[PDB]
Amino acid sequence: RKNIKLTEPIFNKLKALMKVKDVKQYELIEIILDFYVTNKLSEKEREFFNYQLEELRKE
Amino acid sequence: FRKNIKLTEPIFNKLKALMKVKDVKQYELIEIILDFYVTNKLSEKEREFFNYQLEELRKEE
């Protein structure tokens, strides 16, 4: 429901990466989220992420 | 904050869940996952074009 507020340097980096790929803005956020979840969280961090995500979907 | 973005429900839910795993503000989390992707997933040619656009968005201010 609410917008997500960004600083101008962060908005600029999102717009620049938008140019590089060929995707809608929210689709880009999902790609980079997924990439971070898969390649940067520990095993236990990712299990808690999955858990939290399942809780939000029943909220 | 002048700038903002909208997200669909499913993407917003993934951003909120990752917020609960890290301990940073929304805009910081966005930056962290942007930078991680830029550094690790872009080829050298995409990265060059990313840096150029970033210089172009600076000029056009």
Side-chain angles (χ1 to χ4, degrees), chain B residues 1-55:
Chain B
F1 305 94
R2 197 165 83 168
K3 308 281 190 206
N4 73 56
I5 68 169
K6 316 157 306 217
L7 287 173
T8 61
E9 185 184 31
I11 299 160
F12 185 70
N13 285 340
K14 291 170 150 179
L15 179 65
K16 223 188 145 181
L18 191 57
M19 282 286 284
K20 273 144 175 284
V21 170
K22 303 270 138 185
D23 202 345
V24 302
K25 301 183 263 203
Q26 278 186 331
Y27 67 86
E28 299 174 322
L29 181 58
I30 289 178
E31 192 171 20
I32 281 167
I33 67 173
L34 282 160
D35 289 341
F36 184 74
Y37 191 88
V38 166
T39 296
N40 287 282
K41 181 65 169 157
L42 291 196
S43 61
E44 181 180 307
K45 290 305 181 90
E46 299 176 298
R47 200 165 284 98
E48 281 158 13
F49 193 64
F50 176 79
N51 291 337
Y52 168 72
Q53 296 292 336
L54 207 46
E55 190 162 348

Coordinates of all heavy atoms in Angstrom, one line a residue, chain B residues 1-55:
Chain B
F1 N 11.6 12.5 1.8 CA 12.3 11.9 0.7 C 11.5 12.2 -0.6 O 10.4 11.7 -0.7 CB 12.6 10.5 0.9 CG 13.4 10.2 2.2 CD1 12.7 9.8 3.3 CD2 14.8 10.2 2.2 CE1 13.4 9.5 4.5 CE2 15.5 9.9 3.4 CZ 14.8 9.6 4.5
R2 N 12.1 12.9 -1.5 CA 11.4 13.4 -2.7 C 11.0 12.2 -3.6 O 9.9 12.1 -4.2 CB 12.3 14.3 -3.5 CG 11.5 15.1 -4.6 CD 12.3 16.3 -5.1 NE 13.2 15.9 -6.2 CZ 13.9 16.8 -6.9 NH1 13.9 18.1 -6.6 NH2 14.5 16.3 -8.0
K3 N 12.0 11.2 -3.6 CA 11.9 10.1 -4.5 C 11.2 8.9 -3.8 O 11.4 8.7 -2.6 CB 13.3 9.8 -5.0 CG 14.0 11.0 -5.6 CD 13.6 11.3 -7.0 CE 14.5 12.3 -7.6 NZ 13.8 13.1 -8.6
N4 N 10.4 8.2 -4.6 CA 9.8 7.0 -4.0 C 9.4 6.1 -5.2 O 9.4 6.4 -6.3 CB 8.7 7.4 -3.1 CG 7.4 7.9 -3.8 OD1 6.9 7.2 -4.6 ND2 7.0 9.1 -3.4
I5 N 9.1 4.8 -4.8 CA 8.7 3.8 -5.7 C 7.6 3.0 -5.1 O 7.3 3.1 -3.9 CB 10.0 2.9 -6.1 CG1 10.4 2.0 -4.9 CG2 11.1 3.7 -6.6 CD1 11.4 0.9 -5.3
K6 N 6.8 2.4 -6.0 CA 5.7 1.5 -5.6 C 6.1 0.1 -5.9 O 6.8 -0.2 -6.9 CB 4.4 1.7 -6.4 CG 3.9 3.1 -6.6 CD 3.0 3.2 -7.8 CE 3.6 2.6 -9.1 NZ 3.2 3.3 -10.3
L7 N 5.6 -0.8 -5.1 CA 5.8 -2.2 -5.3 C 4.5 -2.9 -5.3 O 3.6 -2.5 -4.6 CB 6.8 -2.7 -4.2 CG 8.2 -2.2 -4.4 CD1 9.0 -2.6 -3.1 CD2 8.8 -2.8 -5.6
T8 N 4.4 -4.0 -6.0 CA 3.3 -5.0 -5.9 C 3.4 -5.7 -4.5 O 4.5 -5.7 -3.9 CB 3.4 -6.0 -7.0 OG1 4.6 -6.7 -6.8 CG2 3.3 -5.4 -8.4
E9 N 2.3 -6.2 -4.1 CA 2.2 -7.0 -2.8 C 3.3 -8.0 -2.7 O 3.9 -8.1 -1.6 CB 0.8 -7.6 -2.6 CG 0.6 -8.3 -1.3 CD -0.6 -9.1 -0.9 OE1 -1.3 -9.7 -1.8 OE2 -1.0 -9.1 0.3
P10 N 3.4 -9.0 -3.6 CA 4.4 -10.1 -3.5 C 5.9 -9.6 -3.3 O 6.6 -10.2 -2.6 CB 4.3 -10.9 -4.8 CG 3.4 -10.0 -5.7 CD 2.5 -9.2 -4.8
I11 N 6.3 -8.5 -4.0 CA 7.7 -8.0 -4.0 C 7.8 -7.3 -2.6 O 8.8 -7.4 -1.9 CB 7.9 -7.2 -5.2 CG1 7.8 -8.1 -6.4 CG2 9.3 -6.5 -5.2 CD1 7.5 -7.5 -7.8
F12 N 6.8 -6.5 -2.3 CA 6.8 -5.8 -1.0 C 6.9 -6.8 0.2 O 7.6 -6.5 1.2 CB 5.5 -5.0 -0.8 CG 5.6 -4.2 0.4 CD1 6.4 -3.1 0.6 CD2 4.8 -4.6 1.6 CE1 6.5 -2.4 1.7 CE2 4.9 -3.9 2.7 CZ 5.8 -2.8 2.8
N13 N 6.2 -7.9 0.1 CA 6.4 -8.9 1.1 C 7.8 -9.5 1.1 O 8.3 -9.7 2.2 CB 5.5 -10.1 0.8 CG 4.0 -9.9 1.2 OD1 3.7 -9.0 1.9 ND2 3.1 -10.8 0.6
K14 N 8.4 -9.7 0.0 CA 9.8 -10.2 0.1 C 10.8 -9.1 0.7 O 11.7 -9.4 1.4 CB 10.4 -10.6 -1.3 CG 9.8 -11.8 -1.9 CD 10.1 -12.1 -3.3 CE 10.1 -13.6 -3.5 NZ 10.5 -13.8 -5.0
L15 N 10.5 -7.8 0.3 CA 11.4 -6.8 0.9 C 11.2 -6.7 2.4 O 12.2 -6.6 3.2 CB 11.0 -5.5 0.2 CG 11.8 -4.3 0.7 CD1 13.3 -4.4 0.4 CD2 11.3 -3.0 0.1
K16 N 10.0 -6.9 2.9 CA 9.7 -6.8 4.4 C 10.3 -8.0 5.2 O 10.8 -7.8 6.3 CB 8.2 -6.8 4.6 CG 7.7 -5.9 5.7 CD 6.2 -6.0 6.1 CE 5.9 -5.7 7.6 NZ 4.5 -5.8 7.9
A17 N 10.2 -9.2 4.6 CA 10.8 -10.4 5.1 C 12.4 -10.3 5.2 O 13.0 -10.7 6.2 CB 10.4 -11.6 4.4
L18 N 13.0 -9.7 4.2 CA 14.4 -9.5 4.2 C 14.8 -8.4 5.2 O 15.8 -8.6 5.9 CB 15.0 -9.2 2.8 CG 16.5 -9.1 2.7 CD1 17.1 -10.5 3.0 CD2 16.8 -8.8 1.2
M19 N 14.0 -7.4 5.4 CA 14.1 -6.4 6.4 C 14.1 -7.1 7.8 O 14.8 -6.7 8.7 CB 12.9 -5.4 6.4 CG 13.0 -4.3 5.3 SD 14.2 -3.0 5.8 CE 13.3 -2.2 7.1
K20 N 13.3 -8.1 8.0 CA 13.3 -8.7 9.3 C 14.6 -9.6 9.6 O 14.9 -9.8 10.7 CB 12.0 -9.6 9.5 CG 10.8 -8.8 10.0 CD 9.5 -9.3 9.5 CE 8.3 -8.6 10.0 NZ 8.0 -9.1 11.4
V21 N 15.3 -10.0 8.5 CA 16.5 -10.8 8.6 C 17.7 -9.8 8.9 O 18.5 -10.1 9.6 CB 16.7 -11.6 7.4 CG1 18.1 -12.3 7.4 CG2 15.6 -12.7 7.3
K22 N 17.8 -8.7 8.2 CA 18.8 -7.7 8.4 C 18.3 -6.7 9.4 O 17.2 -6.9 10.0 CB 19.2 -7.0 7.1 CG 19.6 -7.9 5.9 CD 21.1 -8.2 5.9 CE 21.4 -9.6 5.5 NZ 22.9 -9.9 5.6
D23 N 19.0 -5.6 9.7 CA 18.4 -4.7 10.6 C 18.8 -3.3 10.1 O 19.7 -2.6 10.6 CB 18.7 -4.9 12.0 CG 17.7 -4.2 13.0 OD1 16.9 -3.4 12.5 OD2 17.7 -4.6 14.2
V24 N 18.1 -2.9 9.0 CA 18.4 -1.7 8.3 C 17.1 -1.0 7.8 O 16.1 -1.6 7.9 CB 19.4 -2.0 7.1 CG1 20.7 -2.7 7.6 CG2 18.7 -2.8 6.0
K25 N 17.1 0.2 7.5 CA 16.0 0.9 6.9 C 15.7 0.4 5.5 O 16.7 -0.2 4.9 CB 16.2 2.4 7.0 CG 16.5 2.9 8.4 CD 16.6 4.4 8.5 CE 18.1 4.8 8.4 NZ 18.2 6.2 9.0
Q26 N 14.5 0.5 5.1 CA 14.1 0.1 3.7 C 15.1 0.6 2.6 O 15.5 -0.2 1.7 CB 12.7 0.7 3.3 CG 11.5 -0.1 3.8 CD 10.3 0.5 3.3 OE1 10.2 1.7 3.0 NE2 9.3 -0.4 3.1
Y27 N 15.4 1.9 2.7 CA 16.2 2.5 1.6 C 17.6 1.9 1.7 O 18.2 1.7 0.7 CB 16.1 4.0 1.6 CG 16.8 4.7 2.7 CD1 18.2 5.0 2.6 CD2 16.1 5.1 3.8 CE1 18.8 5.6 3.7 CE2 16.7 5.8 4.9 CZ 18.1 6.0 4.8 OH 18.8 6.7 5.7
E28 N 18.1 1.7 2.9 CA 19.4 1.1 3.0 C 19.4 -0.4 2.5 O 20.3 -0.7 1.7 CB 19.9 1.1 4.5 CG 20.1 2.4 5.1 CD 20.4 2.5 6.6 OE1 19.9 1.6 7.3 OE2 21.2 3.4 7.0
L29 N 18.3 -1.2 2.7 CA 18.3 -2.5 2.2 C 18.3 -2.5 0.7 O 19.0 -3.2 0.0 CB 17.1 -3.2 2.8 CG 16.9 -4.7 2.3 CD1 18.1 -5.5 2.7 CD2 15.7 -5.3 2.9
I30 N 17.5 -1.6 0.1 CA 17.5 -1.4 -1.3 C 18.9 -1.2 -1.9 O 19.3 -1.7 -2.9 CB 16.4 -0.5 -1.8 CG1 15.1 -1.1 -1.5 CG2 16.6 -0.1 -3.2 CD1 13.9 -0.3 -1.8
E31 N 19.6 -0.3 -1.3 CA 20.9 0.1 -1.7 C 21.8 -1.1 -1.7 O 22.6 -1.4 -2.6 CB 21.5 1.2 -0.9 CG 22.7 1.8 -1.5 CD 23.3 3.0 -0.9 OE1 23.0 3.3 0.3 OE2 24.1 3.8 -1.5
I32 N 21.8 -1.8 -0.5 CA 22.7 -3.0 -0.3 C 22.4 -4.1 -1.4 O 23.4 -4.6 -1.9 CB 22.4 -3.5 1.1 CG1 23.2 -2.7 2.1 CG2 22.8 -5.0 1.2 CD1 22.8 -2.9 3.5
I33 N 21.2 -4.4 -1.7 CA 20.9 -5.4 -2.7 C 21.2 -4.9 -4.1 O 21.6 -5.7 -5.0 CB 19.5 -6.0 -2.6 CG1 18.4 -4.9 -2.8 CG2 19.3 -6.6 -1.2 CD1 17.0 -5.5 -2.9
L34 N 21.0 -3.6 -4.4 CA 21.4 -3.0 -5.7 C 22.9 -3.2 -5.8 O 23.4 -3.7 -6.9 CB 21.1 -1.5 -5.8 CG 19.7 -1.2 -6.1 CD1 19.2 0.2 -5.7 CD2 19.5 -1.4 -7.6
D35 N 23.7 -2.8 -4.9 CA 25.2 -2.8 -5.0 C 25.7 -4.2 -5.1 O 26.6 -4.5 -5.9 CB 25.8 -2.1 -3.8 CG 25.6 -0.6 -3.7 OD1 25.3 0.1 -4.7 OD2 25.8 0.0 -2.6
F36 N 25.1 -5.2 -4.4 CA 25.5 -6.6 -4.4 C 25.3 -7.1 -5.8 O 26.1 -7.9 -6.4 CB 24.7 -7.3 -3.3 CG 25.2 -8.8 -3.2 CD1 26.4 -9.1 -2.7 CD2 24.5 -9.8 -3.8 CE1 26.9 -10.4 -2.6 CE2 24.9 -11.1 -3.7 CZ 26.1 -11.4 -3.1
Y37 N 24.2 -6.7 -6.4 CA 23.8 -7.2 -7.8 C 24.8 -6.6 -8.8 O 25.3 -7.2 -9.7 CB 22.4 -6.8 -8.1 CG 21.9 -7.5 -9.4 CD1 21.3 -8.8 -9.3 CD2 22.0 -6.9 -10.6 CE1 20.8 -9.4 -10.5 CE2 21.5 -7.5 -11.8 CZ 20.9 -8.7 -11.7 OH 20.5 -9.3 -12.8
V38 N 24.9 -5.3 -8.8 CA 25.8 -4.5 -9.6 C 27.2 -5.2 -9.6 O 27.8 -5.5 -10.7 CB 25.9 -3.0 -9.3 CG1 27.0 -2.3 -9.9 CG2 24.5 -2.4 -9.7
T39 N 27.8 -5.4 -8.4 CA 29.1 -5.9 -8.2 C 29.2 -7.4 -8.7 O 30.2 -7.8 -9.1 CB 29.5 -6.0 -6.8 OG1 29.5 -4.6 -6.4 CG2 30.8 -6.7 -6.5
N40 N 28.2 -8.2 -8.5 CA 28.3 -9.6 -8.7 C 27.6 -10.2 -9.9 O 27.9 -11.3 -10.3 CB 27.8 -10.4 -7.5 CG 28.8 -10.3 -6.4 OD1 29.9 -10.9 -6.4 ND2 28.6 -9.3 -5.5
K41 N 26.5 -9.5 -10.4 CA 25.8 -10.2 -11.4 C 26.0 -9.5 -12.8 O 25.8 -10.2 -13.8 CB 24.3 -10.3 -11.1 CG 23.5 -11.1 -12.1 CD 23.8 -12.5 -12.3 CE 22.7 -13.2 -13.1 NZ 23.3 -14.4 -13.7
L42 N 26.4 -8.3 -12.8 CA 26.6 -7.6 -14.2 C 27.9 -8.0 -14.8 O 28.9 -8.1 -14.1 CB 26.6 -6.1 -13.9 CG 25.3 -5.4 -13.5 CD1 25.4 -4.0 -13.7 CD2 24.1 -6.0 -14.3
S43 N 27.9 -8.3 -16.1 CA 29.1 -8.4 -16.9 C 29.8 -7.0 -16.9 O 29.2 -6.0 -16.5 CB 28.8 -8.8 -18.3 OG 28.0 -7.9 -18.9
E44 N 31.1 -7.0 -17.2 CA 31.9 -5.8 -17.4 C 31.2 -4.8 -18.3 O 31.3 -3.6 -18.1 CB 33.3 -6.3 -17.8 CG 34.3 -5.1 -17.9 CD 35.7 -5.6 -18.4 OE1 36.3 -6.5 -17.7 OE2 36.3 -5.0 -19.4
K45 N 30.7 -5.3 -19.4 CA 30.0 -4.3 -20.4 C 28.7 -3.7 -19.8 O 28.5 -2.5 -19.9 CB 29.8 -5.0 -21.8 CG 31.1 -5.2 -22.6 CD 31.9 -4.0 -22.7 CE 33.2 -4.3 -23.6 NZ 33.0 -4.0 -25.0
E46 N 27.9 -4.5 -19.1 CA 26.7 -4.0 -18.5 C 27.2 -3.0 -17.4 O 26.5 -2.0 -17.2 CB 25.9 -5.1 -17.9 CG 25.4 -6.1 -18.9 CD 24.6 -7.2 -18.1 OE1 25.3 -7.9 -17.3 OE2 23.4 -7.3 -18.3
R47 N 28.2 -3.3 -16.6 CA 28.7 -2.5 -15.6 C 29.1 -1.1 -16.1 O 28.8 -0.1 -15.6 CB 29.8 -3.1 -14.8 CG 30.1 -2.6 -13.4 CD 31.0 -3.5 -12.6 NE 30.4 -4.7 -12.0 CZ 30.5 -5.9 -12.5 NH1 31.4 -6.2 -13.5 NH2 29.7 -6.9 -12.1
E48 N 29.9 -1.1 -17.2 CA 30.3 0.1 -17.9 C 29.1 1.0 -18.3 O 29.1 2.2 -18.1 CB 31.1 -0.2 -19.2 CG 32.6 -0.6 -18.8 CD 33.3 -1.4 -19.9 OE1 32.8 -1.5 -21.0 OE2 34.4 -1.9 -19.5
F49 N 28.0 0.4 -18.9 CA 26.9 1.1 -19.2 C 26.1 1.5 -18.0 O 25.6 2.6 -18.0 CB 26.0 0.2 -20.2 CG 24.9 1.0 -20.8 CD1 25.2 2.1 -21.7 CD2 23.6 0.8 -20.5 CE1 24.3 2.8 -22.3 CE2 22.6 1.5 -21.2 CZ 22.9 2.5 -22.0
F50 N 25.9 0.7 -16.9 CA 25.5 1.2 -15.7 C 26.2 2.5 -15.2 O 25.6 3.5 -14.8 CB 25.6 0.1 -14.6 CG 25.2 0.5 -13.2 CD1 23.9 0.6 -12.8 CD2 26.2 0.9 -12.3 CE1 23.5 0.9 -11.5 CE2 25.8 1.3 -11.0 CZ 24.5 1.3 -10.6
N51 N 27.6 2.5 -15.2 CA 28.3 3.6 -14.6 C 28.1 4.9 -15.5 O 27.9 6.0 -15.0 CB 29.8 3.2 -14.6 CG 30.1 2.2 -13.5 OD1 29.3 2.0 -12.6 ND2 31.2 1.4 -13.7
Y52 N 28.0 4.7 -16.8 CA 27.7 5.8 -17.7 C 26.3 6.4 -17.4 O 26.1 7.6 -17.3 CB 27.7 5.3 -19.1 CG 27.1 6.2 -20.2 CD1 27.8 7.4 -20.6 CD2 26.0 5.8 -20.9 CE1 27.2 8.2 -21.6 CE2 25.4 6.7 -21.8 CZ 26.1 7.8 -22.2 OH 25.5 8.6 -23.2
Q53 N 25.3 5.5 -17.3 CA 23.9 6.0 -17.0 C 24.0 6.9 -15.7 O 23.3 7.9 -15.5 CB 22.9 4.9 -16.9 CG 22.7 4.2 -18.2 CD 22.0 5.1 -19.3 OE1 21.4 6.1 -18.9 NE2 22.3 4.9 -20.5
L54 N 24.7 6.4 -14.7 CA 24.8 7.0 -13.4 C 25.5 8.4 -13.5 O 25.0 9.3 -13.0 CB 25.6 6.0 -12.5 CG 25.4 6.0 -11.0 CD1 23.9 6.0 -10.6 CD2 26.1 4.9 -10.3
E55 N 26.6 8.4 -14.3 CA 27.1 9.8 -14.7 C 26.1 10.7 -15.4 O 26.1 11.9 -15.2 CB 28.4 9.6 -15.6 CG 29.1 11.0 -15.7 CD 30.5 10.9 -16.2 OE1 31.1 9.8 -16.2 OE2 31.1 12.0 -16.6

